[PDB]
Design a protein around this nucleic acid. Structure first.
Length: 58
DNA sequence: GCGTACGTGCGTTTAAGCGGTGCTAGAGCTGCCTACGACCAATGGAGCGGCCTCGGCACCGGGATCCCCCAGCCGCCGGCAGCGCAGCGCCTGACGGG
C-alpha cells in the first residue's frame, strides 16, 4: 500500500496516530505542519563516503 | 572417549645411621680501662603561623579519530544431484559341436 505523500497538518495536535502521514504509513516531510520535533520526519542522511550504498539508510 | 603415567610392586644396593674416636675452636666469662652520651644553662633563626596574589588545571565545546561492527562480496570447496560412462556379468551371436 504505497501512498503518495500528503502534507499532514497539526496546528495544535501532536504527531499522533491520527497524523495523515502516520496513517499513510509514511514519514512526515518538512512540508508537513508537524513541528521541527516531529518523530515521523526523516533524521538526516549522513553517509560519509557517498549516500549511495547498502549502509546508506537513504 | 581416548591414553598415559603415575600408583603399586619387586628386586638391587648404598648411603644413611650407629657407635666409636680425637681435636681446638670458639664461645663464655672476667678484669679493667675509656670515652661518649646524657645533662645543664644560653641563644637565635628555622620553622611555623598567617595573608594573598596569578595560572595550572578544570571545564567547555568542538572537531578528530578509530575501533567495532557487519553486510557485501567473492573464493573456495565440498556436498550434492544430475549426467556421462567404464567395466563386468550375463546375454546372446557365430559357428562348429552335440
Amino acid at each position: 500500500h504505497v501512498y503518495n505523500y500528503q502534507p499532514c497538518d497539526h496546528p495544535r495536535q501532536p504527531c499522533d496516530s491520527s497524523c495523515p502521514c502516520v496513517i499513510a504509513q509514511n514519514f512526515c516531510e518538512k512540508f508537513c505542519q508537524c513541528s521541527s520535533e516531529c518523530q515521523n520526519r526523516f533524521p538526516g542522511c549522513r553517509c560519509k563516503a557517498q549516500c549511495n550504498t547498502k549502509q546508506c539508510p537513504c
